[PDB]
């Protein structure tokens, strides 16, 4: 129960009378109850790395012994909540303390125990029914958007002996009671899970469904899959805000978990100011994405343990909402800062410095964290299937992808959306460079595309090859100029420009292409590639004649068609329904076919 | 309030460098302050570096020279280092540990604040927004500082970063289209530069705003460690309680890092990267991040840490972690310094992430962003044209190239080149920028929207 | 097939014993049950990193890049459990798959693995990016038992000469590419053009291969000969005239 502080040197506190303590357990040191992690044991002397500043912690101070490791506290109240990396509810600490600082050793519960929740038990469950870990034994109306399914913890099972009637309950109320081998377990609406322990699932299915974002470049050229693993460069003008906002507002992800993991103070202030104001249209009503989002936000002056465990807290919350049956999108703002916190912990423990000073396990930690992303058959009786898509961003030193953190992240992840400050300056938004980006889920999504969007795969391959050919010809243009380019080279260049400026380029502020449905995206790409193929066919088949066609001839004859191709962006998905947009694109293709037939 | 009498111990078990290891201590407190009397009566202060069992390792601020067992007494004050803070310490010169060195009285506390402070709540911090004008054109019209930003100055040994710091202290203020204050902390600053700072602030009539903490190079390095915390505790008191916009200028974070390295070695911690502590990132974050706007309070703390990049290596741990924690950089160029331009601020490698929040209508003016962007573009093009002229010759250059060279010369002679005592309001800075932009015709100013060119280009 | 699995989320130290479990099973199946066992140890980089973690915890003497001073001996305990044995008709063939950190063949893991094992098959990022499958770079690849596994009797008698000549011509083609990056096309002599054509056709017809295409050794040697025939006999200096006369003309 109670230890005592036998010594204090920096953040390391050696506690006596700690015979029963467990390795990597959590302890409240001092009279202010500073959080601390047992990092060593020697007889009764347990060494503790104290998260908060140890100034004023005097010998003889009691050391309360929490019977758990660093464990997130799951249950209603997560949604719309701003936590620290340690699950400290900043938004509740500020309200209760009426201060701009975080009091040393603040012990505010992660989830409010006073707020009441409308809880409806599973109708089938009774007294005596067999229940198993992962079973949804109730549903709580947390929001008009997210129904929080209260479910049994893993490692728990038995026969229900009391299930509460529908009503208003708090996180401290006992909503269920079960028995196994005579041992009786009373379960409230809140459970606790170690952050560093993977939440079990009945099976980890392959990722076979897109994580649509609405950005044409991301959805079409470089698709990510629900349960995917993605990386994003972190720079000043890169534009990661567009990716975060798209995933938060328009993506099919049922839940969003944004982990700052040690950002600058003002950067985190910007995130905390912007995310609450973002709104999404669900069921015709403009709700707030914070009805379904949670923010594990912490700055660079927070406890290093909090910064290093922010990623684990975020992934554990994402896994919880996945098991609930949802599709969650976790977004680490900069895993580089988490890796810096990890290196700092290694230095504090005086562990051997591995490659470029990072710990001897950086790759293992990153791989194990990214392994928690995926699509699973959620554990429990109600057949569910959730997912956790990690979009953790990394910060390459000066644009170099060779540092240990970026190298490990690129090796582990399967998508890299490669935002570019160069394109940001050129005003090509989104700034995805579409040359260093990549996606390894194309072979996984082949089945989905063939079922729903049959032609999209050849369209995307042709677009990618067009862009590659344009990149290769960019050098030839310098050597011999544009006048020396063949007609096929000219058509490739002038459709590559069309794709760059009119397909990849997309403005998130306009009401018509802030969110681009995949049907619209594939329609635009199909029209562009049809133009390219038919122009190339005309050029090749008139190369043999004296009246050979040229790109100049085609442009002069069909300036209207090129204008319409450029204006395909301006079709509003909302006002111009799917049927209307598809019909208009089909009419456009008819016009192109008529014009090309007349010209040829 | 602590009413119990302080305990004085003559139980000195051993002395090792700066450490007096006392024994038989009654419930030793970590970070406790302890005043020790030497055999001959000399009084020194110290901090309980490490606590174990009944022992207490007391790092003595001054050296251990002359300390002995069996005669040296040590009275444990019973509390961690708490500083007395008030508004009246605005217009005072204190040493590293807070003792006045202006022949004034000791601070009559309005409060007793712990120097280590607590981390400002991220949910209570607010985006800095408006601009703090430093009077220097090269960092007003090109690297403006927002109210709440942390923007360091990078420089090397010998460059005039301390002179720039004193100029910023003398000239800093709100845009003004008595709620502003400056907290100058100087660490590891030789007697000459300390006297320069003190006398300059006293003479130029700005001392009414400036609280000056001086830690001379030969003063205790533990005092150097606690100097920035004293300065930022005073800044937090003045900003988040007295509600006045505070600019904290911390000089020689490299010297602070040297003091931190010394304290780590005294603690017997193994050197980390490049011989520095592994937690130096956390320490620098603890210092810097005590800044910014907050919710429900009208004050703020802008920070301008000044670094001496050792060997002019931007990859050195101190500047690297400072760039990781802060939100910009103002580079002091040895090339410009040798060319005798003052301030020798390079605007190409410099940056201020929150310039867009610092500038704009109602904060500085409508055309600030466009003028700054066009000035940067023209300056880069001018450097490129100079490089090209170095190869092709003056004749081979075109009229646009000659215009760019002319703008480069006049931009380094009128915009950058300022003079130590030339206080330019941001409006004067923008007027100079427009004088330089009017070298070119309206067409080559492609980065200034026509809406702004039609209004500000004429005349 | 017998699978021992230790995924990323599984315990780190258990990777220190997974290879030994697999190799003990292989040894039982080969030297006691007389099977021919192909042992495949995937992510020997992960195994070595787990070993480094344990060594760091023990504060053992570190080698290059922090790995324990005995990493060579440990990797040898793993790898040297291969090969045939007298009086027993079994065998254990090992194909560890290890990821070179930062594509650095001089990183301690690949370096010590090359020192211990009897060769290496070098998968090339440049070839993979160019979309050449398998992206194998024969120049840094090596096989220490080819010299005896090829020749007359086993496979064909021109095998060694063809392999050596392909190595030499491929290396000279790479050198010609490097010089061409500097001096441009117009400064290349006819021999350099011959070598560049050989390099192109070698990477397109010899290295490049279907993922399910099973070329016999004779087919591979025939491809090698049709590639070597680019040069005149006098430019093939590795192959003795006796071999060239018999095999070149066809």
């Amino acid at each position: 129960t109670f230890g005592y502080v036998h010594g204090v040197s920096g953040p390391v506190v050696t506690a006596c009378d700690m015979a029963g303590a467990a390795m990597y357990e959590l302890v409240r040191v001092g009279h202010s109850e500073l959080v601390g992690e047992i990092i060593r044991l020697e007889g009764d002397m347990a060494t503790i790395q104290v998260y908060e500043e140890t100034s004023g912690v005097s010998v003889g101070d009691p050391v309360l012994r929490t019977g758990k490791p660093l464990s997130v506290e799951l249950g209603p109240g997560i949604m719309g909540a701003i936590f620290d990396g340690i699950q400290r509810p900043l938004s509740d600490i500020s309200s209760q303390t009426q201060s701009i600082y975080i009091p040393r050793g603040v012990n505010v519960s992660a989830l409010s125990r006073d707020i009441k929740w409308e809880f409806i038990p599973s109708k089938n469950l009774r007294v005596g029914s067999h229940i198993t870990g992962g079973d949804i034994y109730g549903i709580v109306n947390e929001n008009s958007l997210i129904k929080h399914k209260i479910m049994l913890p893993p490692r728990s099972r038995g026969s229900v002996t009391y299930i509460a009637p529908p009503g208003n309950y708090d996180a401290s109320d006992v909503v269920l009671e079960l028995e196994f081998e005579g041992v009786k377990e009373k379960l409230s609406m809140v459970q606790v899970w170690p952050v560093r322990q993977v939440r079990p699932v009945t099976e980890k299915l392959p990722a076979n469904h897109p994580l649509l974002t609405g950005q044409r470049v991301l959805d079409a050229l470089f698709p990510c899959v629900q349960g995917g693993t993605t990386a994003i460069p972190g720079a000043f003008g890169c534009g990661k805000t567009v990716i975060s906002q798209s995933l938060s507002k328009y993506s099919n992800s049922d839940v969003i978990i944004y982990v700052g993991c040690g950002e600058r103070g003002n950067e985190m202030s910007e995130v905390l100011r912007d995310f609450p104001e973002l709104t999404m249209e669900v069921d015709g009503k403009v709700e707030s994405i914070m009805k379904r989002t949670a923010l594990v936000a912490n700055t660079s002056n927070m406890p290093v343990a909090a910064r290093e465990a922010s990623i684990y807290t975020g992934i554990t919350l994402s896994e919880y909402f996945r098991d609930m049956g949802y599709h969650v999108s976790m977004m680490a703002d900069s895993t580089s800062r988490w890796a810096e916190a990890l290196r700092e912990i290694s230095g504090r423990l005086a562990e051997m410095p591995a490659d470029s000073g990072y710990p001897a396990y950086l790759g293992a930690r990153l791989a194990s964290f990214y392994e928690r992303a995926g699509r699973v058959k959620c554990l429990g009786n109600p057949e569910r299937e959730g997912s956790v898509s990690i979009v953790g961003a990394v910060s390459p030193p000066g644009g170099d992808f060779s540092d240990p953190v970026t190298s490990a992240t690129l090796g582990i992840v399967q998508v890299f959306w490669g935002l570019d400050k160069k394109l940001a300056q050129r005003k090509h938004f989104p700034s995805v460079n579409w040359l260093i980006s990549y996606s390894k889920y194309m072979r996984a999504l082949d089945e989905y595309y063939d079922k729903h969007f049959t032609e999209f795969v050849p369209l995307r391959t042709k677009a990618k090859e067009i862009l590659q050919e344009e990149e290769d010809l960019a050098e030839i243009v310098q050597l011999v100029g544009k006048a020396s380019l063949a007609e096929t080279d000219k058509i490739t260049l002038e459709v590559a420009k069309l794709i760059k400026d009119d397909f990849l380029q997309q403005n998130g502020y306009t009401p018509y292409d802030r969110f681009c449905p995949f049907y619209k995206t594939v329609g635009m790409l199909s029209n562009m590639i049809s133009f390219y193929d038919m122009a190339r066919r005309a050029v090749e088949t008139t190369a043999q004649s004296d009246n050979k066609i040229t790109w100049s001839i085609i442009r002069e004859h069909m300036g209207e068609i090129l204008y319409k191709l450029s204006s395909m962006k301006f079709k509003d998905p909302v006002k111009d329904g799917e049927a209307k947009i598809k019909a208009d694109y089909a009419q456009l293709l008819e016009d192109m076919q008529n014009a090309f037939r007349s010209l040829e | 309030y602590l009413s119990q009498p302080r305990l004085t111990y003559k139980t000195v078990s051993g002395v090792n460098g700066p450490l007096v290891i006392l024994d038989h201590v009654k419930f030793p407190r970590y970070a406790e302050i302890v005043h020790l009397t030497l055999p001959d009566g000399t009084k020194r202060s110290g901090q309980v570096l490490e606590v174990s069992g009944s022992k207490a390792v007391v790092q003595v601020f001054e050296g251990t020279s002359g300390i002995d067992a069996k005669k040296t007494s040590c009275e444990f004050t019973g509390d961690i280092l708490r500083t007395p803070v008030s508004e009246d310490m605005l217009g005072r010169v204190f040493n590293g540990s807070g003792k006045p060195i202006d022949r004034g009285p000791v601070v009559l506390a309005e409060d007793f604040l712990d120097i280590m402070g607590q981390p400002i709540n991220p949910q209570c911090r607010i985006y800095p927004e408006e601009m703090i004008q430093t009077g220097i054109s090269a960092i007003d019209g090109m690297n403006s500082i927002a109210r709440g930003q942390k923007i360091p100055i990078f420089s090397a040994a010998g460059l005039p970063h301390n002179e720039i710091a004193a100029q910023i202290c003398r000239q800093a203020g709100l845009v003004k289209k008595e709620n502003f204050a400056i907290v100058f902390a100087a660490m590891g600053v030789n007697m000459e530069t300390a006297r320069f700072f003190k006398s300059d602030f006293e003479e130029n009539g700005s001392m009414d705003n400036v609280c000056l903490f001086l830690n001379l190079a030969n003063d205790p390095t533990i005092e150097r460690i606690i100097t920035p915390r004293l300065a930022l505790t005073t800044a937090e008191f003045l900003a988040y309680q007295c509600e006045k916009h505070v600019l904290v200028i911390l000089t020689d974070m490299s010297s602070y890092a040297e003091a931190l390295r010394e304290v780590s070695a005294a603690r017997e911690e193994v050197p980390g990267r490049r011989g520095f502590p592994g937690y130096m990132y956390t320490d620098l974050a603890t210092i810097y991040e005590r800044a910014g706007r907050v919710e429900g309070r009208n004050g703020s703390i802008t920070q301008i840490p000044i670094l001496t990049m050792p060997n002019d290596d931007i990859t050195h741990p101190i500047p690297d972690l400072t760039g990781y924690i802060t939100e910009g950089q103002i580079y002091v160029d040895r090339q410009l310094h040798n060319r005798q331009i003052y301030p020798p601020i390079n605007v190409l490698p410099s940056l201020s992430r929150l310039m867009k929040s610092a500038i704009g209508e109602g904060m500085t003016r409508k055309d600030h962003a466009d003028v700054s962007n066009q000035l940067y573009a023209c300056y880069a093009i001018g450097k490129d044209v100079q490089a090209m002229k170095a190869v092709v010759g003056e004749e081979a250059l075109t009229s646009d190239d000659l215009l760019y060279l002319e703008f480069l010369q006049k931009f380094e002679k009128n915009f950058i080149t300022q003079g130590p005592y030339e206080n330019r309001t941001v409006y004067e800075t923008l007027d100079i920028g427009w004088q330089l932009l009017r070298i070119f015709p309206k067409e080559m100013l492609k980065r200034i929207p026509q809406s702004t060119l039609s209004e500000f280009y004429p005349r | 097939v017998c699978l021992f699995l230790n995924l990323a989320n599984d315990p780190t130290i258990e990777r220190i014993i997974t290879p030994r479990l697999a190799l003990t099973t292989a040894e039982f199946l080969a030297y006691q049950c007389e099977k021919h066992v192909l042992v495949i140890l995937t992510d020997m980089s992960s195994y070595a990193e787990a070993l480094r973690e344990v060594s760091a915890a023990r504060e053992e003497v570190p080698g290059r890049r922090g790995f324990p001073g005995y990493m060579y001996t440990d990797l040898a305990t793993i790898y040297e459990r291969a090969g045939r044995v007298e009086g027993r008709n079994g065998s254990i063939t090992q194909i560890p798959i290890l990821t070179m950190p930062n594509d650095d063949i001089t990183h301690p893991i690949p370096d010590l693995t090359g020192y211990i094992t009897e060769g290496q098959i070098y998968v090339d990022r440049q070839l993979h990016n160019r979309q050449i499958y398998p992206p194998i770079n024969v120049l840094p690849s090596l096989s220490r038992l080819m010299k005896s596994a090829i020749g007359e009797g086993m496979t064909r008698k021109d095998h060694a000469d063809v392999s050596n000549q392909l190595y030499a011509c491929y290396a000279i083609g790479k050198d010609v590419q490097a010089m061409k990056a500097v001096v441009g096309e117009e400064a290349l002599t006819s021999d350099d053009l011959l070598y560049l054509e050989f390099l192109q056709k070698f990477e397109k017809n010899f290295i490049t291969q279907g993922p399910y295409e099973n070329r016999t050794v004779y087919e591979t040697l025939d491809i090698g000969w049709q590639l070597l025939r680019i040069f005149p006999k006098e430019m093939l200096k590795r192959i003795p005239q006796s071999t060239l006369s018999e095999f070149y003309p066809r």
């Binding site: 005086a350 051997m352 410095p353 | 017997e268 193994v270 050197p271 | 504060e59 003497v61 570190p62």
Partner: peptide, 19 residues
């Protein structure tokens, strides 16, 4: 770093021996 860590470990062992 390895040398300094080894020296620190030896110093700790020697202190224990003296105690």
């Amino acid at each position: 770093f390895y040398r300094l860590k080894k020296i620190q470990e030896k110093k700790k062992i020697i202190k224990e021996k003296s105690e």
